[PDB]
C-alpha cells in the first residue's frame, strides 16, 4: 500500500486527478488477478499422499 | 440615593453580543459561505472527501 502511495506521489506532481489514479489501479488490479488466475495450476487431481506434501510446502513457508 | 455610585442600569445582561449596525446579516452570510466552502469541492464524481 505504501508502494502504491509512493508511486502516486510522482503522479500527483504531474497533475493527474486522484480518481483517474484510483480507477487505474482498480482496472490494473482486476487485470492482474484475471491473469494470475489463469496461470496457476490445480492440485486437486493428485492423490492424498501428494496433497500432504503441498501443505508441507506451505507449512515450511509460513514457519 | 442609598449609594454614592448610582450605577447606570444596563438593559441587557453583561456579556450579551452586539446589535444593529452595518455587517450583522453579512456576517451570517459569510458564516454560511465559510461552511459552504468546506462542502464545495465534494460535488460530483470527480470531487474529494
Swiss-Prot record, chain A:
It comes from the Eukaryota. It is found in: Cytoplasm. Molecular chaperone; assists the folding of proteins upon ATP hydrolysis. Known to play a role, in vitro, in the folding of actin and tubulin. In yeast may play a role in mitotic spindle formation. Belongs to the TCP-1 chaperonin family. Heterooligomeric complex of about 850 to 900 kDa that forms two stacked rings, 12 to 16 nm in diameter. This is T-complex protein 1 subunit epsilon. The gene is CCT5.
Swiss-Prot record, chain B:
It is found in: Cytoplasm. Molecular chaperone; assists the folding of proteins upon ATP hydrolysis. Known to play a role, in vitro, in the folding of actin and tubulin. In yeast may play a role in mitotic spindle formation. Belongs to the TCP-1 chaperonin family. Heterooligomeric complex of about 850 to 900 kDa that forms two stacked rings, 12 to 16 nm in diameter. This is T-complex protein 1 subunit eta.
